Enzyme design. Structure first.
Site, PDB file in Angstrom:
ATOM      1  CB  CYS A 245      24.486  34.436  50.152  1.00 19.90           C
ATOM      2  SG  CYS A 245      22.960  33.527  49.646  1.00 19.90           S
TER       3      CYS A 245
ATOM      4  N   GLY B   8      31.089  43.528  42.226  1.00 20.96           N
ATOM      5  CA  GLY B   8      30.511  42.175  42.187  1.00 20.96           C
ATOM      6  C   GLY B   8      30.764  41.404  43.476  1.00 20.96           C
TER       7      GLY B   8
HETATM    8  C1  LIG Z   1      38.850  43.707  46.356  1.00 26.18           C
HETATM    9  C2  LIG Z   1      38.330  42.276  46.538  1.00 26.18           C
HETATM   10  C3  LIG Z   1      36.813  42.236  46.594  1.00 26.18           C
HETATM   11  C4  LIG Z   1      36.319  40.798  46.692  1.00 26.18           C
HETATM   12  C5  LIG Z   1      34.804  40.740  46.800  1.00 26.18           C
HETATM   13  C6  LIG Z   1      34.273  39.338  46.502  1.00 26.18           C
HETATM   14  C7  LIG Z   1      33.161  38.944  47.476  1.00 26.18           C
HETATM   15  C8  LIG Z   1      32.424  37.692  46.977  1.00 26.18           C
HETATM   16  O1  LIG Z   1      31.226  37.520  47.201  1.00 26.18           O
END
Ligand SMILES: CCCCCCCC=O
Length: 210
Positions: A170, A76
């Site tokens: 974004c 995500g």
């Molecule tokens: C392992 C941490 C991943 C964080 C990714 C979140 C980026 C948000 O748009």
């Protein structure tokens, strides 16, 4: 009753990713307890489900020329940065169908860690991750497959925050990024942040760490 903590130290993203997948397989199979991987990565930018080329300020050739690795992943969120001084945690846990609840529990654990340092942090009603005022202290972006989570969180301890300026997320967000170092005006030992994260997870999930 329990969760296993593995401290991998500094590990390249690609091999760590392959390890995540192998750990995930074992948890899915019921042959490994819920597992929290704690680690650091060499400078890397990952581009998740929501990510596009405009999440990169420069052409992607620039990144590799300037010391970043770059990968497309199924977690995500859009773009994020990992690098030395950032505590990356991959809780690979049998969450089942309740993913939002799991995300809230990770958030809570990070809020507890910050509180231990005298820092008031919050998930915010509107922005993914954990924030201190207008700045993001911890990114969170998970994937769930066969009812078991992978990927996880990225807590800025002694991160080089200047490296975030080259990526352009974004959507709805605060103004900047922050770290325990920036907030406290001094480096925080990584071994200590790891210990506090473990303690916080143990409390939030109600499991004993092994
Ligand atoms: C392992 C941490 C991943 C964080 C990714 C979140 C980026 C948000 O748009």
């Amino acid at each position: 009753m329990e969760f296993l903590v593995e401290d991998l130290g500094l590990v390249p993203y690609g091999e760590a990713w392959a390890y995540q997948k192998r750990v995930h397989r074992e948890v899915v199979a019921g042959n490994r307890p819920p597992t929290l991987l704690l680690l650091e990565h060499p400078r890397v930018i990952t581009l998740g489900r929501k990510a596009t080329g405009e999440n990169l300020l420069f052409p992607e050739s620039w990144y590799r020329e300037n010391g970043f690795e770059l990968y497309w992943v199924e977690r995500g969120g859009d773009v994020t940065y990992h690098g030395p001084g950032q505590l990356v945690g991959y809780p690979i846990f049998p969450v089942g169908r309740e993913v939002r609840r799991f995300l809230r529990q990770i958030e809570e654990a990070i809020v507890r860690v910050a509180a231990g340092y005298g820092i008031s942090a919050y998930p915010t009603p509107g922005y993914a991750g954990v924030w201190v005022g207008e700045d993001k202290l911890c990114a969170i972006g998970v994937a769930v497959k066969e009812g078991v989570s992978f990927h996880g969180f990225a807590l800025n301890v002694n991160t080089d925050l200047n490296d975030f300026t080259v990526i352009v997320p974004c959507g709805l967000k605060g103004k900047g990024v922050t770290s325990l170092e920036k907030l406290l005006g001094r480096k925080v030992p990584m071994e200590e942040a790891k210990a506090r994260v473990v303690a916080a997870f143990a409390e939030v999930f109600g499991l004993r760490p092994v």
